[PDB]
Each structure stands twice: as C-alpha cells, then as structure tokens.
Amino acid sequence: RPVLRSVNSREPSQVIFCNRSPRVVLPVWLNFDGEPQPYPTLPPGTGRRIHSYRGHLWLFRDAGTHDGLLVNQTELFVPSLNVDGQPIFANITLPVYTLKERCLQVVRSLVKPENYRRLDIVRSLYEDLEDHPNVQKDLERLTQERI
Amino acid sequence: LYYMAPEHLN
C-alpha cells in the first residue's frame, strides 16, 4: 500500500489555507489510497477554512500550470493537533524556483505546446519545456526520497 | 471502514 497517503485518524483538525502567492492555488489532498484529490482553488491573497484531520497529507500547486508551490516552506502539509483549540495555518508561497525552471514557466505560458518545437532552441530544452510539472511525478519523487 | 475526507463544510 502506497507510502504517501493520509491516515484515517478520524481526529478533526481545523486548518486555514492562506494563499500568500500571486498564483491561483489548487490544494491537493492525498486520500487513504494515496490518490491525489483536488479541492476548490484559492484566488491570490485569499484564505479559506478547511475541516481536515490529523495525519492527512496535502500538497499545493498552481491550478493553471501545476507549478509546485510550498506550504509552510515545505512540499507537504500534515494538519496537527489543534493546540488550545486554535486552527493551524497552511501558508502557501512561491519557492525560489531555479532561473531555468522560471524561464520554462514563462515560455510555457506564452507558447502553445503544439508550437514548442517551432522555437529556436537546442534539443535538450524542447524536452525540458515538454516535461510539464506533474503531481503524479512529484509523488513518485517524494516516495523515492522517503526511502 | 468509516472514511472521513476533509470538507469545505467550513
């Protein structure tokens, strides 16, 4: 059974998703079988109350492009015990992307995929452009790292 | 089995 998955704790944890990024954020919940399940998106600079649970796993992505985002400065978010009944913050931010990855984001936003190969670049960068960021590949990378 | 997924019930 998949390593990265929420546990069925049945222990409520009040959370507030706080989008501190300029992107439209897609919160993605890993269900009890490790399958990613999307929750409604958050406009930039907005926040939202969630009823989640102890030991559930979340990650967060640009809704339009699936660029990775950070939550409390890391890849994954796990709601904890509500200490003194106070909700937990999930602060969603931009990472410091590599200059390369950031250039790829901008070129992707301007060029339709059918036309990537009509740009005057070397072979390796076409591949790079085509290899869109992807939740499923991120989970496989995280699982491998966690072994 | 009694699965409770997160809600936007909030």
Binding site: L110, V111, K112, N115, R118, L119, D120 | -
Partner: protein
C-alpha cells in the same frame, strides 16, 4: 524593510550591491571606493539626472524597499573626476533583445 537593492552604473560598468535605507550617499561612495579604487571625493552619484548630496540617506534620495527590490534594483548613476574636472554622467544602455517570435505573440 531596511535593505535597498541597487545598480551603480557608469559607462559600461554596473555594480550590483545593497545598502540600508538609513545609510548615506557618502557611505555608498565608500562601497564604490572598495570596488573601483577611486575615493569619494572623486565620485559623483546620481538619481536620474540629480546629483546626490553626500549627507543624505538613500531613503531620502528616493531609494526604498518598495522601489529598489532584489529582482528590480534601482539605478544609481556614477561619474568620476578626471584629475581636475568631473566627467559628464554617461551610462551605456544594455543591448536590445531580438524581435519577439510570432509563436510568442499572445
């Protein structure tokens, strides 16, 4: 909040550096001095075409956290003295990008 990010430009030279909003023009000339080996009494610093007074803070001169950011640093013009006489401020422009490809026109 406190830090301001600058490009000090003269001719074909561009220095990337930071300093505090509270620090002075003269203190900035000292920073230039360490890099370009010319004393403060042989520099003039400019915001646009305006010669900056040595005693003024950078924030007073219009460089602030809001305006002089890491990813979009503010330009400070530099001109040197030439034994007797100060040269005119002259900043050589950067190169021009090619015409945007049709495939990149939104």
């Amino acid at each position: 909040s406190m830090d301001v990010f600058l490009m000090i430009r003269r001719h074909k030279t561009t220095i990337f550096t930071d300093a505090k909003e509270s620090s002075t023009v003269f203190e900035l000339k000292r920073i230039v001095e360490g890099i370009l080996k010319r004393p403060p009494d042989e520099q003039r610093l400019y915001k646009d075409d305006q010669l900056l007074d040595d005693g003024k803070t950078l924030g007073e001169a219009g460089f602030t956290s809001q305006t002089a950011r890491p990813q979009a640093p503010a330009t400070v013009g530099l001109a040197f003295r030439a034994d007797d006489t100060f040269e005119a401020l002259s900043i050589e422009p950067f190169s021009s990008p090619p015409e945007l490809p049709d495939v990149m026109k939104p």
